[PDB]
Amino acid sequence: TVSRCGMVWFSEDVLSTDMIFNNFLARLRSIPLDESPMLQIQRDAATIMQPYFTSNGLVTKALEHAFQLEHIMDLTRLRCLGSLFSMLHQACRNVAQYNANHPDFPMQIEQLERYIQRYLVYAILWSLSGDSRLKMRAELGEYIRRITTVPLPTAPNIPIIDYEVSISGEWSPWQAKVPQIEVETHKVAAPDVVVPTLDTVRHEALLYTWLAEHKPLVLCGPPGSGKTMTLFSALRALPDMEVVGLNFSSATTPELLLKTFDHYCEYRRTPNGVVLAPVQLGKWLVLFCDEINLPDMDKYGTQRVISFIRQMVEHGGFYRTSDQTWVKLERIQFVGACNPPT
Numbered sequence: 001t002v003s004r005c006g007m008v009w010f011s012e013d014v015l016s017t018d019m020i021f022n023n024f025l026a027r028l029r030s031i032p033l034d035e036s037p038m039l040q041i042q043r044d045a046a047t048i049m050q051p052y053f054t055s056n057g058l059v060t061k062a063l064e065h066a067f068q069l070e071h072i073m074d075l076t077r078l079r080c081l082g083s084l085f086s087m088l089h090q091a092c093r094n095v096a097q098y099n100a101n102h103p104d105f106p107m108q109i110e111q112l113e114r115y116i117q118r119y120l121v122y123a124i125l126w127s128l129s130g131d132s133r134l135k136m137r138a139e140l141g142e143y144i145r146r147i148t149t150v151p152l153p154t155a156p157n158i159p160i161i162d163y164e165v166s167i168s169g170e171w172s173p174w175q176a177k178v179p180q181i182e183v184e185t186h187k188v189a190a191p192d193v194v195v196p197t198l199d200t201v202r203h204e205a206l207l208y209t210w211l212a213e214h215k216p217l218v219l220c221g222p223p224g225s226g227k228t229m230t231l232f233s234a235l236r237a238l239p240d241m242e243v244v245g246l247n248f249s250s251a252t253t254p255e256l257l258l259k260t261f262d263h264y265c266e267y268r269r270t271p272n273g274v275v276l277a278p279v280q281l282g283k284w285l286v287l288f289c290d291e292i293n294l295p296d297m298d299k300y301g302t303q304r305v306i307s308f309i310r311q312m313v314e315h316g317g318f319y320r321t322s323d324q325t326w327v328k329l330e331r332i333q334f335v336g337a338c339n340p341p342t
């Protein structure tokens, strides 16, 4: 079949990093996040972060170092860049929310540029090294401090990653965000109780950022790290999206996903076409996949469930085998978790 049809080869050298950055900047400048003053705030943000997205820029050097660096998962340029773009979109939404909550005093340009610069540094930190050891994120932060001009916290030893960026455009530690709860005497070592800590607050923020954009994600970590508890805390605390835990098995097939859909979703006819939406209105059905990587590879190196999820993520829909009709996904998003593939 290889000799039965033509062929075109698209090497990774075809897509330079700079054209990707230009695509992101143009799309951010033109299309709005909500669906306009907030288009204006997008334009101001893009003007601020333009110098850092040029050739031989901060992001390019950080990305090539992260490629020189090591990660738990197979590092891909486009994965990191998509994470960075989504979380910068969330930063723009944060500025919009701050402006809405302060109608009298709009977000001024100097504070805006300081906040955007610091957030973008924090974004590289938590997106390029988001899947590595703490010492290795520390090396990445050290390199960024060496190469960047953006002001950084003056902590003698504490890494930049522990710090967060306030809506006021200042470097603030995540420690002050950690409360001090006192669990009941009869709830000691209870499964449901979640003691806030330094990692819990940061992962809560990351999950909120990456779930507001409805961008699917999978958590990775050694057994016992409580990834499920960390996700479930954010999911229950997040107001209007139901949680449907799904323990994937080695013999899982997309038939299980279809069964879960028909259990929690219904098929309705819309003028665009058949659209899948959760039965309960105003709810973003979040399908938690307990073990995303555990279903087996075929003899041809394909996991059918993961291919199915990829199909519905990239096309924004899937094909119903009952009538061979295109079905779009509405108010549906996915989260998974998995121990390291090693």
Ligand SMILES: Nc1ncnc2c1ncn2[C@@H]1O[C@H](COP(=O)(O)OP(=O)(O)O)[C@@H](O)[C@H]1O
Pocket: 189, 193, 194, 195, 196, 197, 200, 223, 224, 225, 226, 227, 228, 229
């Ligand atoms: N915020 C927290 N507060 C209290 N205990 C925690 C917290 N985060 C993790 N743990 C501990 O980590 C352990 C991991 O739970 P586990 O059953 O391994 O879940 P997972 O399958 O997600 O790893 C829990 O038993 C819990 O005691």
